[PDB]
Amino acid sequence: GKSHGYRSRTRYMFQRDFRKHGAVHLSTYLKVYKVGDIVDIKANGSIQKGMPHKFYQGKTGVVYNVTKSSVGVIINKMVGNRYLEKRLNLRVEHIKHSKCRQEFLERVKANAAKRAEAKAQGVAVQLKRQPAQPRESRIVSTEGNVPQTLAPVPYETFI
Amino acid sequence: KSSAYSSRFQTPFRRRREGKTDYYQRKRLVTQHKAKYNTPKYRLVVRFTNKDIICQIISSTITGDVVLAAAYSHELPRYGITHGLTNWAAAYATGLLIARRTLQKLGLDETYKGVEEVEGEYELTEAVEDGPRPFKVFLDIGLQRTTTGARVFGALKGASDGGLYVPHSENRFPGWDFETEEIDPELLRSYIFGGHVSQYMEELADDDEERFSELFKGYLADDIDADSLEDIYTSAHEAIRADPAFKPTEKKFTKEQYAAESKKYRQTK
Amino acid sequence: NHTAHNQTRKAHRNGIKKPKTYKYPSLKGVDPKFRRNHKHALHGTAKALAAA
Amino acid sequence: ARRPARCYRYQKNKPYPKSRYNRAVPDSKIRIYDLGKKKATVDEFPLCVHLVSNELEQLSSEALEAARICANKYMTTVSGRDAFHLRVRVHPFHVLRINKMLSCAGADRLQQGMRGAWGKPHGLAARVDIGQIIFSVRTKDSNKDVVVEGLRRARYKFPGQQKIILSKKWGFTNLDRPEYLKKREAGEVKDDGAFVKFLSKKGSLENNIREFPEYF
Amino acid sequence: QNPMRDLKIEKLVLNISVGESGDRLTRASKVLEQLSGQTPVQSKARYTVRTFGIRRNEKIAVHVTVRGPKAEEILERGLKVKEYQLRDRNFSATGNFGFGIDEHIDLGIKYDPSIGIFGMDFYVVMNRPGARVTRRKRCKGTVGNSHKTTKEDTVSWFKQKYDADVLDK
RNA sequence: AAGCUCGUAUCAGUUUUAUGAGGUAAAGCGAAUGAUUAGAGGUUCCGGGGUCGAAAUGACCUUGACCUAUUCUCAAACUUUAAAUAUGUAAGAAGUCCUUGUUACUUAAUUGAACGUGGACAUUUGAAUGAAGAGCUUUUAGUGGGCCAUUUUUGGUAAGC
RNA sequence: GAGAACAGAAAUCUCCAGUAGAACAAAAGGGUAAAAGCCCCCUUGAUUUUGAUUUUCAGUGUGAAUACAAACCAUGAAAGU
RNA sequence: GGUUGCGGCCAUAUCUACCAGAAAGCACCGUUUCCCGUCCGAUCAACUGUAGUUAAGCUGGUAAGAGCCUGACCGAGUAGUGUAGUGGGUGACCAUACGCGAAACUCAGGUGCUGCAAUCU
């Protein structure tokens, strides 16, 4: 008989990191959570009260409700030919803020600054990113790094 | 030990190795209802060394706890007490001191006055009417075993009586009868003062007079007899109501001559 | 007996549609203790703007 | 009721060793993996010959035995028992299964078709790779002529292309001959009954000086 | 030398292992109520057997721990029963020892006529001042090898105190 | 199929930058659990034997055990470690910052939460490429026996199974 | 592992090591050490009202669970649960 | 800098063996009248800080130490792997092309960092 449980296929998913068993450090219980915050999901088996389903392990959602010991996140789930809003309730132990946004916000802070700086400076500025452009010309000095001839090695003396 | 033991050993946290904190307790004292987002949660740390008392008011950050106010028993001599610094009465006094200190640090010394006349009664701080609420702290007794009649619920009482809303019940005060499940305010008023020690003193003073000296050698300094204690500790109380502020010591050295000596004992690599 | 061959194609023909978020979403699952106070707050703001 | 070996040659089904899930399994026909002068020092037999595979297949417990004996009777009978040390390097841990279309056992004509065609175990195999030792022989430099032919007589008793290598290494060490002498004239070597114990330059100096006192 | 390093005795245990409950054990308990002043505690059993006939949660043995100078007194009046003589096997590696006895009136007790005869084990442990740090709740800490009791410390203390005769056989 | 509201939105079977999750391939077992070949060094008052023996908490052979330091080989239902491929999210106007309004929730509090007013930034409005328009609704058909190929893969000796 | 009369490989008693190799009703996997385990104290949140949500899923049921609200209770010094 | 209370990151902090530690501090220590808990004031409670010490604990040093951490012209661009071919081969398997890219080994170096309050020659 086939089993389809709330925790099937979780031998290795919810078991703690090596040598990180035990209580949870308090810096999970002090990170404050507001709505709109973008949080990544990662369960620990030590806290069974508030757990997510194995689907939402790995995912990333946006908070919409904040209660005692717990929060609520909206995750969009592909099923069939569309996505569905899933309003699930978790405890704060199965959660961490996403650093993607903490890296985007500082960039906003920075480009706003140099935008307001260029208005004082009397210059125009680029603040769109651009990808890894090709490499430009150069001149390679040959003074100490004079080329060492190479050649393929054989199989004999190697085996 | 073998190698595969110490390769796999999970070290507990540092303060659990040191035996100095219970994180099971710390979790439940520190956490707040997340809907109270960044409001802190103030603790009344109270600790009992061998010949000193610490009382501290502690909020919590991610980069370690923060002290709002602090009160050690080694500053009661400023208010008149010179002996028995690890005493139920001293604990009451110290709790009262930290209470009154904080309550004026904030601007609530006048509004919540506590109980300026003690009787040993179970009286929790009430809220003022159409006005600011009382300061709500909690209590962590470290690792101490809660037992009725301990020094630490003395400081619980002292803070409760100074004003800053420490919620508690009576059945770990002294004088509380396990049988009828009620309290004996007279005995508690005694214990607030030297009620459990003055009796021993004035008992030995006509039972065994030399051992009285062996112990209370310092009470024979200024000729402190076993009826002076009400008027000692109550003057201490009034003094603490009066000027609870923390006036620190004078530093004989500016913290660099202090390091200059110990650096030539520290035994570097 | 459960071939999944040709389901992704059928999905992607009429497409996989994102849910089309809105502004001012629903408040059916939030703390009612916050819901009530919000309801009382917004009327007050309405009134305060009714004059100014 | 032995199936041939050409049915169980290729590494097709992922391994099914003896365990609590597969308790009832026959023992192998190879038990002795060490032959010759076992208790002989690494100094006596410097020369090491190997037998390598060049394909990826499965070796039977009985073939390993039959090649073992075919290499033993030759060397023992031309050179002697205390001339060589042979190590069968591979162990058969994979288990071979067999349907055994049993026509009976419980009632009238029963157990037909392949309803529930899982296998009853009937053999053990050794999974082998592209470049992997099987026979590792250790002798002097005066007996390679025998060792080669002993291995060449064995490669007939199991399938595939199995090529013979004359190792640069001393004995069953990982070190080459002259490096071993650099260590032996130095005090970097200590003897065990069947092997060696090298010296380190990390560790407790007292425990490292008690041993290798010829060093320092 | 130093104070707070001499092997001050800490306790002594008086075990009696009957094997079966009844009035036998109450007579085994009325023997210590006067030799100690401390009401003993009856040891429940732990496992089962057919030979002794024991089962779990049966009180088949008693013991009591005594400290202070009363332990010294008992041991003083219990070693003169052994003619002050003890052997080397009796001393453990951990620095504490023990020995058994049969005639519980050798100590010199008022023999109540109904208790009869039955033996008794003594085990005596001693340590240096400062082994609280294994017991206290806050800031436990093992003790160090420069302060730790040993068999050789024990026999030396036992040659000095109790005046001589450890049969170091 | 009928269309409806709009007109290049903010969408995409795609890449990049940033940030997360995984426990497969490989690898390892002188690292855990299990499996396994070998000898060597020890230990016993203590598993068996043998000589010396009145005996031994006696001695020596010896094989078993365990203990130590190595050594050979393995794991779909073992693992410290840990890829490739595939995968979640973000890349702004529904934004950022300033100011200060409401509330019966919250705070020790004139604290915080949530939603706001009024301001400034509106040009490269904050990566690449593309866009044959984007979004939305009603209704109904036929189908609901599937087969083949590369690669991964389970049974089976194997099969055009 | 070291030790204590009868007492022995094993009753009881004492110390040291001991990251879990124990236990947690029951399969297997996970999880757990001032505990989630062992002992004790008080107890009935195994309660009332009806809703939102997750899993299986048509995003119907049923079953089981998660997080809040309003009332009443227990426990505890208290947080808290 | 030393120490204490509360702590954050939880082994660079652990483990083992030895040595040292002025100051205060911490501690060990001293007594059971009382609340209190024990068979045992050992634990726990309360009392004096008064009697006595640095032996312990604690902190710091040491070690071609175990362990852990970090990083590499170590291994290895190896193993594995995505895509491709009317490529090789009886086949198993393999090579090549465009790309991603490990682990174990080996070597070197490292051995707690720090926040609030108080306090000490």
Report DSSP letters for C7-48, one per residue: SHHHHHHS--B-----SS---SSS-HHHHHHHHHHHHHHHHH
Give me the long-range contacts of B8-11 (CB less than 8 A, separation at least 24): B8/A19, B9/A19, B10/A19, B10/A20, B10/A21, B10/A22
Chain C nearest-CA distance from B122, in A, is 33
Which residues 93-152 on B are within 7 A of strand H at the CB atom? 140, 142, 144-145, 147-152
Chains E and C touch each other (3 or more Cβ pairs < 8 A): no
Method: cryo-EM
Q: Is B4 within 8 Å of chain C by CB?
A: no
Contact C42, C50 (CB under 8 A): no
Strand H lies under 7 A from the Cβ of residue D54: yes
Q: Helices B185-192 and B88-106 sit at what angle, rounded to 10 degrees?
A: 80
Resolution of the entry in angstroms: 3.3
Rounded to the nearest angstrom, the gap between the alpha carbon of residue D146 and the centroid of all alpha carbons in its chain is 19
Compute CA distances E41 → D199, E32, E34, E65, whole Å: 60, 10, 14, 9
Q: Which of A27, A117, A50 is nearest to B64 (CA)?
A: A27
Contact E78, E122 (CB under 8 A): yes
Rounded to the nearest angstrom, the gap between the alpha carbon of residue D149 and the centroid of all alpha carbons in its chain is 18
Residues of C in contact with A83 (CB under 8 A): 16-19
Query: What's the rounded Cα separation, in Å, for the pair B43 and B59?
Result: 6
CA torsion angle for D147, D152, D157, D160 (degrees, to 10)? Answer: 130
* Cβ contacts from B onto E, under 8 A: 12
Strand partners, E63: E41
Contact B103, B112 (CB under 8 A): yes
Contact A69, A29 (CB under 8 A): no
Chain B residues whose C-beta is within 8 A of a chain E C-beta are: 18-20, 142-143, 145
Angle at E154 between CA E149 and CA E160, to 5 degrees: 135
| Continuous H helices in D21-104 | 61-78
**The length of chain B, given as a count of residues:** 269
Please count the other Cβ atoms lying within 10 Å of the Cβ belonging to residue E16. Answer: 22
DSSP SS3 for B172: coil
Which residues 100-119 on E are within 7 A of strand G at the CB atom? 100-102, 118-119
Distance of C1' in H112 from CA in E91, Å: 43
Query: What's the rounded Cα separation, in Å, for the pair C3 and B27?
Result: 50
Contacts for B35 with CB less than 8 Å, ≥ 6 apart: A66, A67, A68, C31, C33, C34
Contacts for A124 with CB less than 8 Å, ≥ 6 apart: A118
Nucleotides on chain G that have an atom closer than 7 A to a protein CB are 1-8, 10-20, 29-36, 51-56, 58-59, 64-70, 76-81
Compute CA distances D99 → C26, D12, D105, whole Å: 62, 16, 15
Strand partners, D170: D47
Neighbours of chain D (3+ CB pairs under 8 A): none
Q: Which of B45, B69, B24, B73 is nearest to B166 (CA)?
A: B45
Distance of C1' in F101 from CA in C44, Å: 10
Tokens of residue D99, six digits: 């349907």
Using C1' positions and the CA of B167, the closest nucleotide is G78
Compute CA distances D11 → A110, D16, D111, whole Å: 60, 12, 29
Closest chain B CA to residue A71 = B34
Residues of B in contact with E137 (CB under 8 A): 19, 143, 145
Compute CA distances D141 → D35, D53, E128, whole Å: 19, 24, 68
Angle at D70 between CA D66 and CA D74, to 5 degrees: 165
Closest chain C CA to residue B36 = C34
Closest chain A CA to residue C33 = A67
Query: What's the rounded Cα separation, in Å, for the pair E12 and E79?
Result: 13
Strand H lies under 7 A from the Cβ of residue B260: yes
**Probe site for chain A from B13, B29, B34 (most A CB atoms < 10 A):** B34
**The length of chain A, given as a count of residues:** 159
Query: What's the rounded Cα separation, in Å, for the pair D147 and D164?
Result: 10
Of B23, B38, B60, the CB nearest to A32: B38
Rounded to 5 degrees, φ, ψ at D211 are -85, 155
| Continuous H helices in E51-109 | 68-79
Q: Is B265 within 8 Å of chain A by CB?
A: no
Query: What's the rounded Cα separation, in Å, for the pair A57 and A6?
Result: 13
Q: Which of E79, E96, E34, E42 is nearest to E64 (CA)?
A: E42
Task: Check CB contact under 8 Å for C25 and A64.
Answer: yes
Query: What's the rounded Cα separation, in Å, for the pair E152 and B109?
Result: 66
Rounded to 5 degrees, φ, ψ at D72 are -75, -50
Using C1' positions and the CA of B177, the closest nucleotide is H35
Place of tokens 């003083």: E76
Strand G lies under 7 A from the Cβ of residue E39: no
Rounded to the nearest angstrom, the gap between the alpha carbon of residue A46 and the centroid of all alpha carbons in its chain is 23
DSSP E strand boundaries for chain E: 9-17, 41-44, 59-63, 65-66, 86-87, 97-101, 120-126, 166-167
Reported as type and span, the H/E element at residue B48 is: strand B42-48
